[PDB]
Ligand binder design. Structure first.
Ligand SMILES: CCn1c(S)nnc1-c1nn(C)c(C)c1Cl
Ligand SMILES: [Zn+2]
Ligand SMILES: [Zn+2]
Ligand SMILES: [Zn+2]
Length: 231
């Protein structure tokens, strides 16, 4: 029942309820003539919503807000971007204009600025060292170390046992490495093991792109990254 590129028309977003008060959002974008799906997270925060990641661009992100407004009807007050690339921060301006408080680590904000990307407004302290965790309302934010990017965060929802791995975790269908331009291939397995050690109770694991699974996605990702490293 998870949405695929198949049932997502250009510029639209689908929502998927994972657990009580936790959804993913799914959008699509084209590059080099192929079409890629992309996930973020929505976490209910009392009578407000916490958003994890944009929907990969201004158009998609305005569609995301409109779909949330339609289907959940609680205000998005805060968003966290889990790394600096455009599939995670593209649309920050749209969120900012809609009165959403946008957040990221100083690591991410720095890299976004270097990249000439949109820059989340607010800074998340206490995540600069590998293994650092901070609470952010109904989630914990964890910096497991460099992996897909040097700044990548993961997000755990303790009430629902949902681990959102973002782009540091691969879906099972991906059996070769994706975009690694800014990756730390050397540290990526170590970083995944920190995630394993910190959230061994996770029941649902959501990759940045494609299908949810369980903690098997961590070892899966390790296998893929190691195979790439040894090319
Ligand atoms: C969506 C995959 N991706 C991730 S993960 N980080 N960066 C990307 C990315 N690759 N390309 C071609 C674009 C436009 C983006 Cl964003
Ligand atoms: Zn990326
Ligand atoms: Zn603010
Ligand atoms: Zn991504």
């Amino acid at each position: 029942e998870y949405p695929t590129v198949s049932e997502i028309p250009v510029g639209e977003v689908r929502l998927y309820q994972i657990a009580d008060g936790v959804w993913s959002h799914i959008a699509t974008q084209s590059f080099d003539g192929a079409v890629y799906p992309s996930n973020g997270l929505i976490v209910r925060d009392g009578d407000e919503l916490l958003l994890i990641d944009t929907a990969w661009g201004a158009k998609n992100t305005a569609a995301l807000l409109a779909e949330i407004e339609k289907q959940i009807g609680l205000p998005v007050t805060r968003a966290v971007s889990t790394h600096f690339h455009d599939d995670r921060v593209g649309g920050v301006d749209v969120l900012r204009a809609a009165g959403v408080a946008t957040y990221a680590s100083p690591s991410t904000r720095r890299l976004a600025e270097v990249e000439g990307n949109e820059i989340p407004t607010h800074s998340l302290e206490g995540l600069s060292s590998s293994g650092d965790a901070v609470r952010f309302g109904p989630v914990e934010l964890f910096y497991p170390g460099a992996a897909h990017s040097t700044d990548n965060l993961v997000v755990y929802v303790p009430s629902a046992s949902v681990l959102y791995g973002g782009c540091a975790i691969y879906e099972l269908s991906r059996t070769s490495a994706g975009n690694v331009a800014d990756a730390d291939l050397a540290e990526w397995p170590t970083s995944i093991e920190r995630i394993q050690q910190h959230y061994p109770e996770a029941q649902f694991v959501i990759p940045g792109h494609g299908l949810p699974g369980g903690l098997d996605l961590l070892k899966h990702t390790t296998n893929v990254v190691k195979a790439h490293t040894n090319r």
